[PDB]
């Protein structure tokens, strides 16, 4: 029920989600902000699954992360990111497996412009382009379709729109209201786009 | 000495212990921090052998979250173990409300650990103190000096370590309130010179603000008249 | 020298000092080896009321098994338990009865282990351990209070330390049938408790017991046939 | 399986077959295990429940014996003598019957054993005991029998038991009674492990017989 | 699996075949069920493979650790009772039905242990998938008395007839000879196109030397 | 400087901790126990609290007993011969709970023994003040009594006196073979021996097992007393 | 059904002086999603040994780093490269420690065993560490039986390092293009004494 | 009560460690020679029996071990070195190397130097043994130090007995030359009180070969 | 009585043990370190026991901790070994969590806080060694940390421990350099090492001597000092 998007490149990496708050037969809200955990240092953790296990495992994860950066005094690599976040989220499968899926992005000098899909059994790799929920089935061959390598942020944008107005048309979730992040040119962006 | 009392009264009345862990910080290095309307000036001493010594690797001023910083004077690797200590509470707050920590909580939990240091079995006093600067849940600015005994408290402006009485004194003399950035910088250097030898490169500074607590490059801190 | 730590000599004087309380108890005992046998003998006295018949030194660890302590009387009650743990916990876990030799090489490291541990007392106890191995031949295993094991042919614990090895040797010597060489046996072994405390002694006040191929199990000799080797000896 | 014990005059008789399972996978299976000298015991249920409590108590009787001794000086067929001639050290066959009971009793919840123990000593002369499932103990002055197959001997032996019986016809009762469980459960089978044991000494017989009618 | 043991005049023989099959099908079709717990001990397993062969390794150095504190030839109610208190500690979980044979002061000792942990002294034994048949040949042929080789043909028999009569059960046959001096083991006992250069085609391809 | 502690030995190789808690027992209140020719009589003189008149008449009773038909008594301090005695108490409980049988006396002697010694083996432990006399009677075993010294050792008597005057108790009572003597007979020598080694009535305390208790514990009857005295 | 997850296969198979270890391109989803085509599933631990893990991807990624940590620790202790049939033995026990709560992996070990004569070394193992000792090739995964089919029919016993190539090739495209959730595109690795090549096949993506 | 008895001197020495040192310097003499196929150690009241007293031990089938100091110490040590041995040989399924195992001992010495209520051991040790890469032999002190060597002497007068190896050995050397020049320099120190054990598997050479030699 | 109380300040606010450790490190051999444009130098002295040792494979002062990172000892050799031991354990757990090679930074200040945890916890005695840790990581560069028992720790771009310091570290201040070659640091470090000796010739039978350059190590063989001796 939880739609995650997310779309890699040379010059961006861009992610996407519904900001839809469910509970039972009803959406709690419109604006829902317990998906997007960016962390500092040009990194993003998107989460989906249940909104308790979200909340906690985004904020172990992005309060962990951030007392790195401070005990050592450094930002950390976003493949670090990626692969400690794994680890966690592996440590818990057995014992009490948070079911939140996710998809970490970001910038490094050394690696570019990283993504990194991941479910909720904590099984990760590197992709160019990724998604999550039911709506990944219907926003998936889109990507495929029209991803090419040097693609610009306008072009990327285009395609997630065309995503969103598939996961409105034939998605029986008519998801309308997304919001986003762009990592470029050194910074981070947020926008909100409505069907 | 798993579970022994180190830390035991005199027949006097004191403890011993926290007087030698007081003498540890007498032997520490110096410190000063000053306050103005919504930052704050951290100066503290360097001491780096030249052309040898990595001049950066030393770090007296740390950083603790995205609001608190600390400076401390006494002995360095037990001020390493109690500044990851406090980053780590730091961390544990945000965690468990969801605000940043404010200043006067960290010191008090600071105090707090370093008093059950020196009363818990099978464990030597903290011999350092250290003068915390931060924020406070009203967005007001303040700094708390808190001593090797536990004890905690807040401060216009102190001064910490080696020779601290003739900086408190200096300090006394030259504060005013509500000071630009340029004097309240001065003043620091100013004031932690009266101690330490006139040189730019015996002394680290910095400046607190709400965004983040930048550092004073060494060419700024030449050309002090 | 109160810890068990090394002095500036080198020397640990307490295990020193726990050797010369066995020593202090003023007891006998002497072990001898025979061609399909092992004999103990021991002089069955304290370290007018008092009941005689109860006092003894030596004891049954298994029925194979048999030894005889020396020394502190609690340290030595305590020892004895821990030997018959031990043989316990060897015949749980393999299913066999241990032997003499590995009996005493696990006593003296839990001996060891309170040797180098300044927490723990030293056990002012020495012992001998005699039993029959799975080859049909005899066993005599000597340990003390520093945790180190030896076999003997012949062996004696008390007072009379290397002075009793001359009469030993004179008659293992003078020596070099299962019931002639259990007689013989019992024989040097009763003459050389009476040679070593040189007066003459009463059936009544010394312990004599025997293992061998033809009684495996451990057992002492009634007062009659101590009395019947004395009278034939003299 | 079958497992009997009877008392006679100046003595205890246990008796056990060797079948050991639809498929029968072992057919010389001794049974009886000896506990002491002057106590054996025969198992029924588990073979693993049976040779690890057996062989615990083997342990227990190990250490009994060896406290329980004293200072000072006092006073195709086989057979043994006791080493303890008067009994000074033994232990007693209520003793390791009820250290028994309480390790059935105490881990009854997987434990799915039962046991004939029959031994003797000077207080109370020749002894049967039986620990049921559950791990209850009761004292049987006659008799007791255990296993699947004795469920078609239980008239048998209670019409042919006598008080005061001899040792020869209460061996022909004893083997009778097994060679008839024998005949009428699957179960139970091979040949014949008897045990008897006296003030003095124990005799062990091992008999091959089928029956004809 | 046929796993196979007997008793000689002085000496135990084991014998098995050498087929491990993961489901229907072959995954190994010369492998080593004989295992060495020690120079005078020798054992064959059935049941989970793992269990087994982890066991048997834990055994052996268990065996060694003994051998070498007590300084003494190793026994073979030594290797049952640790394997027996192992084996019930997991309550059959470890699923390990193991024939072991040996030589010690008390003569040749061959044991059934099976996987609950209840262990058997006994004459000869058989298991496995196909340890039905080698039973049936072994009750047949075995006799009071016989000599190594009449046992060395009689054990070749039996794992002959359970590579035949039984799916789970093939290969060649091995045989091990346990005596008290020493052992002697027979791992073969009995034993009953090129493609062009380029024509698969390539994305990539990248050399580095090391 | 070698006696400041139970776990170290002098040069003369002996623990001097020991020693002074045999001097600590030995200088206090006596007790003794004898074996008369059909049971076990045993004897307890208070006398250290003669100056204490406030007490509660025949109330510091020094005889406990262990299953009712084995006694034990004391000579040291109160508290731990108490912790003894509960020990005691709980073994033969366990040996009753496993074994369905009374404890024989000589296994639990040695293992209340093992007790006493533990604790003279670690650094960080007092050892126990107290020597204990545990003693029973049988019709077919007649009497034995232990007495286990501080040390742990554990020695079988005819006869035993701990406390203080132990040398004029044993000295007097080694006079007459109590072994052909009925136990109603013993009671006039024993209160002579007192008299020997007013306030006789109220600062002693006795207990007997014979026919005439079935051989059980029993505290003997002021009515028998009496006329003893 | 917990290999059916994301499916995956390799395999591993030797010649003269030259051995070789192959696998399938895939990260599945939910049996039948393919969200990676990259996922590799061999990786190198020293010169002389690699391993292929096929199973759960979470526990081939848990399974890899530990081996990495213990051989790390073996070589820097002991300062030299860990010999194959210790590794193989460290990966038995490993598997097996983990008995009752195990990772879903089969792993092969693929390389050279020094003696200097360079023979090759293949085993493989279940998720409970059972050990494979295979002479000619070894195969674990969700297309075991495709493999095994192929291995056994195209063989050929000391074949040069092109020959080897081209069989271990053929025989794994040929197993991937009957499995649906295995293939999309294939690593080839061959291992000789001096060089190492790394290949990826053109493979069917469907 | 866990407070470390070995502390540290004003003169920056931990005295407890040359205390022990002492100690091994008064024990009997221990050596060991490595030759280009060999490696060799040996060592120097009429009742004791000599096959009980053995100094010289084995490990592992190529791997040895003889000390100098006290005995309790080094059976504890050698049952040690037994169960890491055999540990690693369970977990990597191959006989462990000697530098391994020396690396392990001397943690564990180095372990009772600084644990409270402890003292270190009174003892050093020689390790021989072969493997893939040759022939080893490591000296370990009761400092924990694990140092390896050609050729060394240990206990009494070592200088002495080092200095007449020094000049008598040499590195292209045979196992008779090597037990010939070990015999030498223990009679020079000092046939019956002479034990040798060389490494092929770890053997000990009887006192006919010690004779013939 | 028994407790010695090592965990425990002095009147004038110090740790006995800490200095008794650091004048006991004093003693012991030399130790040298330095970092140049291209690696980072580290060098030692050996304590001549007997030639009767097997120097050919014999390094009792540097050691490999990881790939990136290496360290050189000057203290007690037992008291390092464990040490170094616990450095390689936190440099594969690092890898293991993060994926990535750990700073150089992170390991010194990760067993300085376990020095300073038996400083100021228990019972124990301080580890009386000090470590010249040098390393290569891609956050910093190359780098080279000097510790001590007391967990206080520096960086340092060269510099020396063990007994005549005073000496080493004059002729580093003399001779040493921002922009120097490998062989010029090799040929500082024999320069440095002998006049720590009062030598001018050192000798090559007992000096070790070892660097790290981007990652690789290498150990200089007895006979690969022989060429940087003669030149």
């Given at each position: 029920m939880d739609t995650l998007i997310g779309l890699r490149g040379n010059n961006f990496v861009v992610l996407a989600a519904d900001t839809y708050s469910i509970n039972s037969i009803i959406k709690?809200?419109?604006?829902?902000?317990?998906?997007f955990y960016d962390i500092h240092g040009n990194k993003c953790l998107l989460l989906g699954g249940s909104i308790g296990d979200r909340l906690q495992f985004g904020e172990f994860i992005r309060k962990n992360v951030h007392l790195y950066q401070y005990q050592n005094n450094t930002d950390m690599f976003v493949k670090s990111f990626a692969f400690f976040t794994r680890k966690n989220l592996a440590y818990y499968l057995?014992?009490?497996?948070?079911e939140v899926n996710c998809l970490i992005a970001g910038y490094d000098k050394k690696d570019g412009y990283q993504l990194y899909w991941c479910d909720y059994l904590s099984n990760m790799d590197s992709v160019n382009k990724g998604a999550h929920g039911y709506g990944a089935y219907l926003v998936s061959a889109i990507l495929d379709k029209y991803y090419?390598?040097?693609?610009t942020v306008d072009e990327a944008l285009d395609i997630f729109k065309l995503c969103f107005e598939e996961l409105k048309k034939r998605?029986?979730?008519?998801?309308?209201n997304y919001e986003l992040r762009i990592m470029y040119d050194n910074k981070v962006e947020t926008q909100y786009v409505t069907v | 000495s798993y579970d022994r009392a180190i830390t035991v009264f005199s027949p006097?009345?004191?403890?011993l212990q926290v007087e030698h862990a007081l003498e540890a910080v007498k032997k520490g290095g110096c410190a000063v921090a000053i306050k103005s309307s919504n930052f704050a000036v951290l100066a503290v001493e360097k001491k780096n052998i030249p052309k040898?010594?990595?001049?950066?690797?030393?770090?007296?001023?740390?950083?603790?979250?995205?609001h608190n910083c600390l400076a401390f004077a006494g002995l360095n690797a037990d001020a390493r173990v109690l500044v990851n200590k406090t980053r780590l509470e730091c961390q544990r707050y945000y965690l468990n409300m969801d605000e940043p920590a404010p200043v006067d909580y960290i010191a008090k939990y600071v105090a707090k650990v370093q008093q059950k240091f020196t009363h818990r079995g099978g464990v030597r006093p903290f011999g350092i103190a250290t003068l915390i600067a931060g924020f406070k849940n009203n967005k007001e600015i303040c700094i708390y000096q808190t001593e090797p005994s536990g004890i905690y408290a807040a401060w216009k402006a102190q001064a910490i370590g080696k020779n601290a009485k003739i900086v408190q004194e200096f300090l006394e003399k030259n504060y005013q309130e509500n000071m630009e950035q340029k004097d309240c910088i001065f003043l620091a250097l100013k004031a932690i010179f009266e101690v330490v030898?006139?040189?730019?490169?015996?002394v680290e500074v910095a400046l607190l603000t709400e965004k983040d607590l930048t550092f004073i490059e060494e060419q700024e801190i030449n050309s002090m008249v | 020298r109160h810890l068990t730590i090394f002095s500036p000599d080198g020397n640990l004087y307490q295990i020193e000092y726990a050797i010369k309380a066995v020593k202090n108890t003023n007891i006998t005992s002497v072990g001898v080896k025979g061609e399909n046998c092992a004999v103990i003998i021991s002089q069955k006295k304290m370290a007018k009321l008092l009941?005689?018949?109860?006092?003894?030194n030596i004891y049954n660890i298994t029925d194979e098994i048999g030894c005889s302590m020396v020394g502190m009387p609690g340290d030595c009650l305590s020892m004895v338990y821990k030997a018959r743990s031990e043989a316990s916990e060897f015949l749980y876990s393999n299913g066999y009865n241990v032997n003499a030799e590995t009996l005493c090489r696990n006593i003296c490291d839990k001996i060891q282990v309170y040797t180098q541990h300044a927490y723990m007392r030293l056990h002012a106890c020495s012992g001998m351990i005699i039993g029959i191995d799975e080859n049909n031949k005899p066993e005599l295993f000597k340990f003390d209070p520093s945790g180190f094991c030896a076999g003997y042919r012949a062996c004696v614990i008390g007072n009379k330390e290397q002075e009793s090895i001359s009469v030993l040797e004179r008659l293992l010597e003078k020596r070099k049938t299962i019931d002639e060489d259990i007689r013989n046996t019992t024989i040097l072994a009763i003459e050389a408790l009476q040679t070593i405390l040189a007066f003459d002694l009463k059936a009544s006040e010394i312990e004599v017991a025997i293992v061998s191929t033809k009684n495996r199990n451990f057992t002492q000799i009634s007062e009659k046939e101590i009395d019947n080797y004395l009278t034939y000896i003299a | 399986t079958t497992i009997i014990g009877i008392i006679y005059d100046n003595g205890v008789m246990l008796a056990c077959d060797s079948r050991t399972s639809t498929f029968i996978?072992?057919?010389?299976?001794?049974?009886?295990?000896?506990?002491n000298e002057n106590l054996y015991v025969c198992r029924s249920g588990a073979s693993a429940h049976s040779q690890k409590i057996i062989e615990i108590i083997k342990h227990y009787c190990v250490s009994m014996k060896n406290e329980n001794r004293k200072k000072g000086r006092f006073h195709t067929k086989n057979k043994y003598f006791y080493e303890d001639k008067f009994n000074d050290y033994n232990p007693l066959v209520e003793n390791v019957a009820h250290i028994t009971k309480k390790i059935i009793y105490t881990n009854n919840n997987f434990l799915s054993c039962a046991l004939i123990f029959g031994g003797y000593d000077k207080i109370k002369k020749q002894q049967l005991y039986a620990v049921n499932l559950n791990g209850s103990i009761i004292e049987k002055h006659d008799f007791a029998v255990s296993g699947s197959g004795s469920i078609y001997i239980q008239s048998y032996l209670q019409d042919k038991?006598?008080?005061?019986?001899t040792k020869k016809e209460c061996f022909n009762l004893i083997l009778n009674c097994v060679k008839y469980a024998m005949h009428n459960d699957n179960s139970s089978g091979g040949l014949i492990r008897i045990v008897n044991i006296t003030k003095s000494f124990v005799e062990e017989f091992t008999v091959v017989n089928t029956q004809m009618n | 699996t046929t796993i196979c043991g007997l008793v000689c005049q002085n000496a135990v023989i084991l014998g098995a075949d050498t087929r491990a099959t993961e489901g229907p099908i072959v995954?190994?079709?010369?492998?080593?069920?004989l295992h060495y717990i020690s120079k005078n001990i020798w054992c064959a397993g059935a049941g989970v493979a793992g269990d087994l062969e982890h066991t048997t390794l834990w055994l052996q150095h268990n065996v060694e650790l003994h051998r070498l504190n007590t300084n003494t030839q190793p026994r073979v109610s030594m290797c049952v009772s640790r394997l027996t208190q192992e084996l019930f500690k997991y309550q059959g979980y470890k699923v390990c039905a193991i024939v072991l044979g040996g030589v010690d002061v008390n003569g040749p000792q061959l044991y059934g242990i099976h996987p609950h942990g209840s262990s058997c002294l006994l004459p000869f034994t058989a298991l496995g998938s196909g340890s039905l048949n080698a039973m049936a040949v072994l009750e047949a042929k075995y006799r009071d008395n016989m000599t190594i080789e009449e046992g060395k043909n009689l054990v070749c028999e039996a794992i002959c007839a359970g590579i035949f009569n039984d799916l789970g059960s093939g290969g060649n046959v091995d045989i091990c000879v346990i005596t008290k001096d020493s052992y002697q083991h027979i791992r073969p006992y009995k034993e009953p196109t090129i493609y062009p250069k380029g024509t698969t085609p390539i994305l990539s391809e990248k050399i580095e030397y090391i | 400087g070698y006696d400041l502690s139970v776990s170290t030995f002098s040069p003369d190789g002996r623990l001097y901790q020991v020693e002074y808690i045999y001097k600590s027992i030995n200088n206090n209140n006596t007790a003794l126990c004898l074996e008369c020719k059909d049971g076990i009589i045993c004897c307890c003189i208070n006398?250290?609290?003669?100056?204490?008149?406030?007490?509660?008449?025949?109330?510091?009773?020094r005889i406990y007993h262990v299953n009712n038909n084995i006694i034990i008594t004391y000579s040291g301090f109160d508290g731990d011969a108490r912790n003894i005695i509960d020990r005691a108490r709980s073994e033969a409980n366990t040996y009753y709970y496993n074994f369905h049988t009374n404890i024989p006396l000589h296994i639990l002697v040695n293992r209340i023994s093992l007790y006493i010694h533990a604790?003279?083996?670690?650094?960080?432990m007092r050892p126990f003040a107290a020597s204990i006399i545990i003693s029973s009677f049988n019709e077919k075993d007649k009497g034995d009594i232990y007495c286990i010294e501080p040390n742990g050792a554990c020695y079988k008597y005819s006869g035993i006196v701990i406390g203080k005057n132990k040398e004029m108790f044993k000295t007097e009572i080694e006079?007459?073979?109590?072994?052909?003597?009925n136990v109603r007979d013993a009671i006039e020598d024993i209160y002579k021996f007192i008299l020997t080694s007013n306030n006789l009535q109220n600062l002693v305390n006795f207990s007997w097992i014979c026919k005439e208790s079935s051989y059980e514990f029993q505290n003997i009857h002021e009515e028998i007393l009496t006329p003893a005295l | 059904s917990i290999y059916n997850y994301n499916g995956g296969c390799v395999l591993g198979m030797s010649g003269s002086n030259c051995v070789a270890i192959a696998c399938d391109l895939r990260l599945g989803?939910?049996?039948?999603?393919?969200?990676?085509?990259?996922?590799?599933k061999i990786f190198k631990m020293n010169n002389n040994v690699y391993v292929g893990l096929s199973g759960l991807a979470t526990d081939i990624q848990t399974l890899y780093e530990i081996l990495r940590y213990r051989v790390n620790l073996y070589e820097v202790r002991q300062d030299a490269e860990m010999d194959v049939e210790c590794f193989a033995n460290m990966l038995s026990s490993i598997l097996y420690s983990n008995r009752?709560?195990?990772?879903?992996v089969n792993p092969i070990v693929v390389g050279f065993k020094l003696k200097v004569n360079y023979e090759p070394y293949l085993t493989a193992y279940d998720l409970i560490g059972?050990?494979?000792?295979?002479?000619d090739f070894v195969v674990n995964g969700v297309t075991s039986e495709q493999l095994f089919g192929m291995c056994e029919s195209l063989y050929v016993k000391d074949q040069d390092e092109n020959g080897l190539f081209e069989t271990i090739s053929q025989c794994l495209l040929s197993a991937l293009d009957?499995?649906?959730?295995?293939?999309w595109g294939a690593e080839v690795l061959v291992l000789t004494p001096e060089k190492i090549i790394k290949k990826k096949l053109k493979a069917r993506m469907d | 009560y866990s407070f470390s008895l070995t502390t540290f001197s004003?003169?920056?020495?931990?005295?407890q460690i040359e205390y022990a040192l002492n100690r091994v310097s008064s024990s009997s003499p221990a050596l060991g020679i490595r030759a280009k196929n060999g490696v060799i150690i040996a060592t120097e009241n009429?009742?004791?029996?000599?096959?009980?007293?053995?100094k010289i031990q084995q490990i592992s089938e190529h791997i040895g071990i003889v000390y100098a100091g006290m005995p309790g110490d080094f059976r504890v040590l050698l049952k040690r070195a037994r169960k890491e041995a055999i540990r690693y040989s369970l977990q990597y399924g191959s006989e462990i190397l000697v530098k391994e195992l020396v690396k392990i001992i001397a943690s564990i010495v180095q372990e009772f130097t600084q644990t409270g209520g402890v003292r270190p051991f009174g003892l050093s040790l020689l390790i021989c043994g072969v493997d893939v890469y040759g022939y080893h032999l490591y000296q370990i002190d009761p400092s924990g130090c694990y140092f390896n060597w050609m050729a060394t002497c240990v206990g009494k007068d070592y200088q002495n007995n080092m200095s007449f190896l020094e000049k008598?050995?040499?590195?292209?050397?045979?196992i008779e030359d090597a037990i010939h020049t070990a015999i030498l320099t223990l009679k020079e120190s000092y046939e019956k009180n002479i034990e040798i054990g060389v490494a092929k598997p770890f053997k000990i050479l009887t006192q006919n070969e010690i004779k013939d030699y | 009585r028994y407790d010695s109380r090592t965990t425990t300040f002095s009147?004038?606010?110090?740790?006995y043990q800490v200095e008794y450790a650091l004048e006991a490190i004093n003693n012991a051999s030399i130790t040298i370190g330095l970092i140049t444009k291209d690696g980072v130098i580290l060098g030692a002295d050996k304590v001549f026991?007997?030639?009767?040792?097997?120097?050919?494979?014999?390094?009792?002062?540097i050691y490999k901790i990881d790939k990136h990172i290496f360290c050189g000892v000057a203290g007690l050799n037992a008291d390092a070994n464990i040490l170094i031991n616990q450095s390689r354990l936190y440099a594969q757990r690092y890898l293991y969590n993060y994926n990535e090679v750990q700073p150089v930074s992170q390991l010194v200040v990760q067993i300085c806080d376990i020095k300073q945890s038996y400083t100021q916890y228990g019972g124990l005695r301080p580890y009386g060694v000090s470590f010249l840790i040098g390393g290569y990581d891609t956050k910093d560069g190359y780098q080279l940390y000097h510790t001590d028992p007391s967990g206080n720790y520096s960086g340092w771009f060269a510099t020396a421990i063990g007994t005549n310091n005073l000496t080493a570290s004059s002729v580093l201040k003399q001779e040493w350099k921002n922009d120097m070659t490998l062989e010029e640091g090799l040929l500082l470090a024999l320069k440095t090492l002998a006049k720590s000796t009062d030598t001018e010739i050192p000798k090559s039978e007992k000096i070790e001597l070892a660097y790290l350059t981007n990652v690789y190590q290498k150990y200089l063989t007895?006979?690969?000092?022989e060429e940087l001796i003669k030149l």
């Open positions: 709690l809200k419109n604006d829902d902000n317990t998906k057995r014992r009490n497996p948070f090419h390598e040097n693609l998605f029986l979730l008519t998801q309308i | 006097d009345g004191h403890l040898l010594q990595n001049p950066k690797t030393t770090e007296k001023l740390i950083k603790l979250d995205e030898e006139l040189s730019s490169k015996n | 009941d005689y018949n109860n006092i003894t | 996978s072992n057919k010389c299976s001794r049974k009886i295990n000896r506990i038991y006598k008080k005061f019986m | 995954a190994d079709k010369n492998c080593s069920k | 006398s250290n609290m003669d100056k204490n008149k406030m007490i509660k008449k025949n109330s510091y009773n604790y003279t083996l670690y650094w960080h006079k007459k073979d109590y072994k052909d003597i | 989803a939910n049996t039948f999603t393919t969200v990676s085509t990259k996922f590799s009752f709560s195990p990772y879903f059972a050990k494979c000792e295979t002479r009957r499995d649906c959730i295995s293939g | 004003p003169t920056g020495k931990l005295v009429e009742l004791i029996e000599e096959n009980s007293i053995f008598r050995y040499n590195k292209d050397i045979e | 009147p004038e606010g110090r740790l026991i007997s030639k009767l040792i097997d120097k050919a494979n014999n390094y009792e002062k007895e006979k690969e000092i």
